[PDB]
Design a protein around this ligand. Structure first.
Ligand SMILES: O=c1ccn([C@@H]2O[C@H](COP(=O)(O)OP(=O)(O)O)[C@@H](O)[C@H]2O)c(=O)[nH]1
Ligand SMILES: [Mn+2]
Length: 284
């Protein structure tokens, strides 16, 4: 039977947070024994899914790089199913998948407003989980397409509910977190509250958990629309509210989703995934 000590060695990275107050491991490079987990999960014959949306210019700009890198780095050695949601299945880039990789494409209705595109994913992912994903995989990861796998992103990231530490704020005090601060929004998080600021670019867990994550976030999104308000960082603001109320069983270090435009600090030892485009933190 799998024990935490069978694969997690937090002491290997003493200068960073390797475990939360609620005892969820924060996985950093050097703290995991992937070999042990690979053998463990292989024996259970697990399958992992990955949902990614590419609507509009995003298809030509990031879909191919995202998939080609995913093919090479995502859960290597384990069955993986890529669920690709596009608005125009014709612009689809054509790539060869390697061993244990396969895919399923779905044509979706494109939202006109980009923020809507980002948020509607919560709705779409949920529908698909109920319709088929719950029957196809043991774990599911939902990701932004505007990123690229730089190295192995494996089973060490698997968990019941998994969150990603946001690259910009992983060392910040919660009061500096860009949580939704208006009480009128369902994503509202009071100053003086919060554990971490999670990035909406990557989140996952078992289909059941992801279903709950997406259903709750989408309901918050809908509520805000009827209350004439929209969370500062849309689905990400709601995701942070959700993870605050429902603590994740695993958190991935910013090494699993790094922003090269803020450089490469000492704590980032081996990037597994990186943002594709430079993004500002404007307030004025
Ligand atoms: O026009 C759009 C806007 C968003 N997206 C999807 O929604 C995700 C979230 O949007 P975005 O990445 O642009 O947010 P950011 O990381 O820049 O804050 C993207 O990664 C895409 O998968 C898309 O396909 N087309
Ligand atoms: Mn993004």
């Amino acid at each position: 039977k799998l024990k935490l000590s069978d694969w997690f060695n937090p002491f290997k990275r003493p200068e960073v947070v390797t475990m939360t107050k609620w005892k969820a491991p924060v996985v950093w490079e050097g703290t995991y024994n992937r070999a042990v987990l690979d053998n463990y999960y292989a024996k259970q014959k697990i399958t992992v899914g990955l949902t990614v949306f590419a609507v509009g210019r995003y298809i030509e700009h990031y879909l191919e790089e995202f998939l080609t890198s995913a093919n090479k780095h995502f859960m290597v050695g384990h069955p993986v199913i890529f669920y690709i949601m596009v608005d125009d299945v014709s612009r689809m880039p054509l790539i060869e998948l390697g061993p244990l990789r396969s895919f399923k494409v779905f044509k979706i209705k494109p939202e006109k407003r980009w923020q809507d595109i980002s948020m509607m994913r919560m709705k779409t992912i949920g529908e698909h989980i109920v319709a088929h994903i719950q029957h196809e995989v043991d774990f599911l990861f939902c990701m932004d397409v505007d990123q690229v796998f730089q190295d192995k992103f494996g089973v060490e990231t698997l968990g019941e509910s998994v969150a990603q530490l946001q690259a910009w704020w992983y060392k910040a005090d919660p009061n500096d977190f860009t949580y939704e601060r208006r009480k009128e929004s369902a994503a509202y998080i009071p100053f003086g509250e919060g554990d971490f600021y999670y990035h909406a670019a990557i989140f996952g867990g078992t289909p059941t958990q992801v279903l709950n994550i997406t259903q709750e976030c989408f309901k918050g999104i809908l509520k805000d629309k009827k209350n004439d308000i929209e969370a500062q960082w849309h689905d990400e603001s709601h995701l942070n509210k959700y993870f605050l109320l429902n603590k994740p069983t695993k958190i991935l270090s910013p090494e699993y989703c790094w922003d090269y435009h803020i450089g490469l600090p000492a704590d980032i030892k081996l990037v597994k995934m990186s943002w594709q485009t430079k993004e500002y933190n404007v307030v004025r």
